Every structure is written in C-alpha cells, then in structure tokens.
Nucleic acid binder design. Structure first.
Lengths: 218, 115, 62, 202
RNA sequence: AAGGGCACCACCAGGAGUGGAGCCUGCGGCGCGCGCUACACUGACGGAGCCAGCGGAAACUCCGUCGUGACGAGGAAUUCCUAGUAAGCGCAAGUGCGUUGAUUACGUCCCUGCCCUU
C-alpha cells in the first residue's frame, strides 16, 4: 500500500486541507502551543486572538482523518494551513499522538524544526513546505470549500462525477467561527454537507464516509 | 597564384590560404573529416553544401587555427573558408560568380561574412 | 468549439489599464464587418492570429 | 571526389535536400493558424546550434528555429546552464526516439506538441477588493510558443526525476503525449486546467 | 485637486539566490553578514580525445566498467538583476583572465514612491 505524497501528481485521491489552523508556540522559559485553556487569561489581556487559539480543533480533525478507512486504504492525504500562513504536509502513516498534551509537544517541535523524522526511516512524518498548496497538489484535482452557506451536496454523488483520473481537494476551516473564504483564491466552488452547521471534525468524517462509500472502502 | 583570408571569433583566429590545385581541404594539416567537436561537424560542411561541391574541384584550402574554446574554432573556420572562397572567385574568375556566391551565402547566414 | 480567429488592427496608443493586460481592437477575419474590443495578456503588435472562444465580451478597464 | 574524401552520407543528404541531423523540413506544416510565423520550421538547418543573437530586438527570437529554441530551454537549472552541446545531443536522440515510436517527422511531432499546448485564455490577477478575483485575458501567440516550450521542457526535466530514464526519453514521452493529446502529458493537463479556470472567470 | 513624466529600493512577466546543516570568517552582544563543504546514472570511476586568455587548464567529448543498493535540497521573510550578460568552469597575479553559455525584460503608469508643470 504505497504512501501518498505531494511528489506523486497522478494518483486519484482525496485531499483534506485543514485551513486556518490555530498553531502558535508560546514562550513563558519553555515552549507550548497557544491554546484557549492555558492562555484565555493572557489572550484577553492583549484583547485579541479571541478563539484564534483552538489548536484542539486541528488535533481533533487529524485523529478523525487518519483514523479513517480512506486513510487506512491509502487514498487520502492531509495538509495543514495555519492562521499565520504555515503549510504542513502530513505523512499518511503517521500515528499522531492521541492526547492534546502530547500533540502540543510534537507540534511545537515540528514548528521549530520544520520537520518530524522517523527514528529509523528518512522519510518525514510531518513537513513544513512552501506555499502555495497548489504547487504540491495533483495535476488534475477538483478543489472545493466546505461552507454552511453553500449549496448542500450528497458527497457520494459529488464524487462519482469525478474523472477517473481526477482527484478531490477539500478545504475545511479548522476553527470555531469565521468567513469561509480562507481559500476563495484556489477553489472551483463551495459546498455545504448538511442543513445543520457542522464542526470541522464532523465535516471531515462526513466527507471521508462519503468517499469511502463511493470508492468502495470498508 | 594565391590569396589568403582569416576568420575570427571570441578569442580564436583562423588563417586560410587558397591556391589552385587538385581539390583537397585541410585543417591544421588534417583532412576535414576529423574536426572533432563531432556534433558541430556539419556546421563546417556548410560552406561546401550551401554552394555545391563542384566549386571545390580545382582549388585548395590550407587552414590553420589558434586559440579560443572548442566552438570558437569551428565558427572561425567556417567564416574563413567562406571569405577565402569568395576571394578566390573574385580575383581569378568572373565578377558574376562572385555575386552568386555572395548572395548565395548571405541568404543562408550573415555570420559567414561579418565577424 | 466554434473557435474564431481574428487579426489585430489597432493596439491602443493611450489607455487605462492594470499592467500586463492591454486592450486591442480586432477585426474578425471571417467577415470584415465585426470589430471587437478585447484584452490580451502577452506582448502584441499588429497583424496576427487571435484565438477566440467567447465572442462578444465587450470588456472594459481592468 | 576531392583530395580529402568526404563521405557518401555526407555528399548526398547534404547538397540534395538540406535535411536535419538527417530529417526533412519540407512537408512539416504548422497545424494551427495564428501560431505560424512564430513556430520557425521554414528555414532549414543541420544542427540545433545556431550561433545567432536573438536578444537585441523584441521579436527576433521568433526567427529562431523552434528546434534550437527547444534545445536552449533544455539547458537549465544552474548545473546545466550553458551546456548546449549536451542539449544538442539530447535533442538529436529525442527526435530519433520519437521517430521510432511513430515514424512521422519527430520535428512535426515537436511542432504539434508546441501547437496543441499553448493556452487560449490565461487569467490575470484583477484587483478584487482584497480577496482577489482572477479575470478571464487572452494570450499572445509569442507567449503561446514561449510558454509551451517552457512547459514541455520543465515537464521532461522535472517530469522524469528520480527514475530509470534519460531526458532524451522523458522528452520524447512529453513531446509524443502532447503531440496527440491524451491526458498523459503534464503540459496538456496543465493547459486544460489553466483554461478550465478561465471559463470560470467569465 | 489636474496634466505630464521617471523608477524592478514600483508594477507588469522570469532567473539566480539569501533566510535551513556543520565549519571558516567579520559584526553585535556578553542575534546578523560574506563564505567553504555537503545531502549521484544530465553520474562516478578507467582508457582515450584534446582546446584558452590575462600573466597540451578544468568543465567538456568519445569508448568502456559500475547498475540504484548535523545535513535526505531548506519557515515566515527577503536581495540582485536585461548579452558573450547570468550561471557554470578553471587559470595567472597579490584583483584580473579567458572557456561553455542561457531563460526573461526592453513594457506601462494599475499600486508605492519621486520629479515637472498647472
């Protein structure tokens, strides 16, 4: 089961980009991720970043995606895209840390070193890469933005319409609120998935489920 | 009854004697099939093939070179063989033969006559 | 696709535009009757092929 | 005969037609109006190693044989700068590989790839009002040619990187796939996407 | 406010990078700049071919052998740039020289600046 990366420009696959992700280190003399639990005090004092500190959402989404069959089947890769404009590629075989405390440690280290390397292997597990995301994407790739205010779709149907050699890239806002335009400049359209507002993770399961159904994944 | 010219490129030069004879073509004391950047080779056949290889029946072309890179010599001696040949026809054969060779070369390239 | 080729008549001498893009009056080359104002991206002088798909578009300062 | 031999395959092919390395220029037509006058296949040449100067005036570069234009674009990423002799070799080989894989004039094959590669409507970065929106411009025939050559060489070069192939090969691959159109070619895929994008900005 | 202009410390279209590693070296302080060496097959090794200029050079070419077996090609930022030039290459001299040799620009006032005149 060949591991999918940006280097491969041909394979048909599903890509999720967790746009607008809240990852930021915090000094204190030790480092941690800026996050609404520890730093709601500080954030308010400064009078900003009100919910600009939700790295947990990213964490949730990641577990949700990598834990998914479509990932296990090797038909999915993920990318991150930080509020501050940092882009990350996520090796699909990475067993991301289960808890947020351990997640934080590792994201703090990834951000400072720009990559996370397997202790025995020379392929990275996470890698900071250069914008724009559209260089690293497959050549024939449909690009959409998930949005509550966009026309609702059935993902299974939305997917069966894709050319047999055409990938699908979905941008999810990994955040608590905000305009869904974090990607207007790249996408072909925006779609809704439910008549109910969803959380990023749920949008993500919903979409994986759908691809899993349509691409025959159990 | 000789005439001579010379051709130039970047930092090389080539001198070409023309005098009438049995019809051979020489570079540094070597026949011309052995000039060895090997892919630019036909590039020096070009003053032969743009004219027709009957003109080279009665004449003889001694050529020797100095200096420059290993492209410079080839450009040099194609220029020098062209100017030498038109020189020979100009001085010992009719003016109009000189005109046909001149316009015939000039339509193909311009480097052959002006360095 | 009903692709239609055109020929430039007049690149404009005084304009107003964003840099890079220039407006061109085109003669239509199937008939001589139609003339359009269009927008080109690359550097363009007179008398050449233009590939057209959308056939009117009547564009303006961009 | 003259005092210093000069071979048969030389004497012949040469003075008769003025073939390529040894391919005929006559009978290759620019299967696309517009783009003629810009794809230069009408003044024939033995090697793609012209020592001319196409930089002084704005469009002189069109009078440059498209073959040699292709071969110049080959010579890049810093390590390959100035290495035309290499390029000329690569080009020669490619042509052969192309002809083995379809008879044809591989130079016709080259022309076509350049012919059916250029975009029709490229997108400019209009103002937008902050969250910028691209606007559907048409593109010039010189750019069409320019960009094509660009695409196919960046294709071959970067196309077949860590693998078991030679640029000559991967250039034949990229030129053959594009000289027909069958979504197997990184330049065709790219053109069709630049264009799909344009119909979106209309 | 108006009309002209000029400019990659502007824009329109690219190249080469710098900002990543260790080390060398200068500067600060008690982080910053110039560099050197690096992470193969468009290669390496062996023959062989064999060409400069300033004061039988290397890259390179051909024929063979080998056969994919800290740093894994550099974050946010950001510099300079229009032909024998850029880059590559080596050479003499205490900065010069030649060899190989390009892609892109030669456009505009949309933007940021400045200049002119009103």
């Amino acid at each position: 089961p060949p591991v999918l990366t940006s280097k491969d420009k041909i394979t048909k696959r599903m890509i999720v980009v967790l746009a607008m992700a809240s990852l930021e280190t915090h000094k204190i003399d030790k480092y941690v991720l800026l996050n609404c639990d520890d730093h709601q005090g500080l954030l308010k004092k400064m009078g900003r970043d009100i919910s600009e500190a939700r790295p947990d959402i990213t964490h949730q989404c990641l577990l949700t995606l990598l834990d998914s069959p479509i990932n296990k089947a090797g038909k999915l890769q993920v990318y991150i895209q930080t509020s501050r404009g940092i882009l990350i590629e996520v090796n699909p075989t990475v067993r991301i840390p289960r808890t947020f405390k351990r997640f934080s440690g590792l994201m703090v280290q990834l951000l400072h070193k720009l990559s996370i390397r397997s202790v025995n292997s020379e392929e990275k597990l996470l890698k900071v890469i250069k914008n724009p995301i559209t260089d690293h994407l497959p050549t024939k790739c449909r690009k959409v933005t998930l949005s509550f205010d966009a026309p609702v779709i059935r993902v299974q149907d939305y997917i069966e319409k894709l050319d047999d050699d055409e990938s699908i890239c979905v941008f999810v806002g990994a955040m608590a609120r905000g305009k869904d335009n974090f990607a207007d400049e790249y996408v072909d359209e925006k779609v809704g998935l439910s008549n109910y507002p969803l959380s990023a993770s749920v949008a993500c399961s919903k979409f994986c489920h759908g691809a899993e159904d349509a691409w025959n994944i159990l | 009854p000789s005439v001579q010219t010379f051709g130039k490129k970047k930092s090389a030069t080539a001198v070409a004697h023309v005098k009438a004879g049995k019809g051979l073509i020489k570079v540094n004391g070597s026949p011309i099939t052995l000039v060895e950047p090997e892919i630019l080779r036909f590039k020096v056949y070009e003053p032969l093939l743009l004219v027709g290889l009957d003109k080279f029946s009665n004449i003889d072309i001694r050529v020797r070179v100095t200096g420059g890179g290993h492209v410079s010599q080839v450009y040099a001696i194609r220029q020098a063989i062209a100017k030498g040949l038109v020189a020979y026809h100009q001085k010992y054969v009719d003016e109009q033969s000189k005109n046909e060779l001149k316009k015939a070369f000039t339509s193909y390239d311009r480097t052959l006559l002006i360095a | 696709t009903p692709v239609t080729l055109a020929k430039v008549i007049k690149v404009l001498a005084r304009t107003g535009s964003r840099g890079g893009v220039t407006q061109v009056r085109v003669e239509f080359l199937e008939d001589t009757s139609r003339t359009i104002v269009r927008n080109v991206k690359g550097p363009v002088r007179e008398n050449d092929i233009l590939v057209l798909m959308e056939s009117e578009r009547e564009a303006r300062r961009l | 005969v003259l005092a210093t031999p000069i071979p048969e395959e030389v004497q012949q092919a040469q003075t008769e037609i003025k073939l390529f390395n040894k391919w005929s220029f006559e009978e290759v037509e620019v299967k696309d109006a517009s783009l003629v006058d810009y794809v230069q296949v009408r003044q024939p040449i033995f090697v793609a190693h012209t020592a001319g100067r196409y930089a002084n005036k704005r469009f002189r570069k069109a009078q440059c044989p498209i073959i040699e234009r292709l071969t110049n674009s080959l010579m890049m990423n810093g390590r390959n700068n100035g290495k035309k002799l290499k390029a000329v070799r690569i080009i020669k080989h490619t042509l052969d590989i192309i002809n083995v894989l379809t008879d044809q004039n591989p130079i016709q094959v080259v022309v076509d790839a350049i012919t059916n590669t250029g975009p029709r409507e490229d997108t400019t970065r209009v103002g937008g009002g902050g969250a910028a929106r691209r606007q559907a411009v048409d593109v010039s025939p010189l750019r069409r040619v320019n960009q094509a050559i660009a695409l196919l060489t960046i294709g071959a070069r970067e196309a077949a990187f860590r693998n078991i192939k030679t640029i000559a090969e991967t250039l034949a691959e990229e030129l053959i796939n594009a000289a027909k159109g069958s979504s197997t070619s990184y330049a065709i895929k790219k053109k069709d996407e630049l264009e799909r994008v344009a119909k979106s900005n209309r």
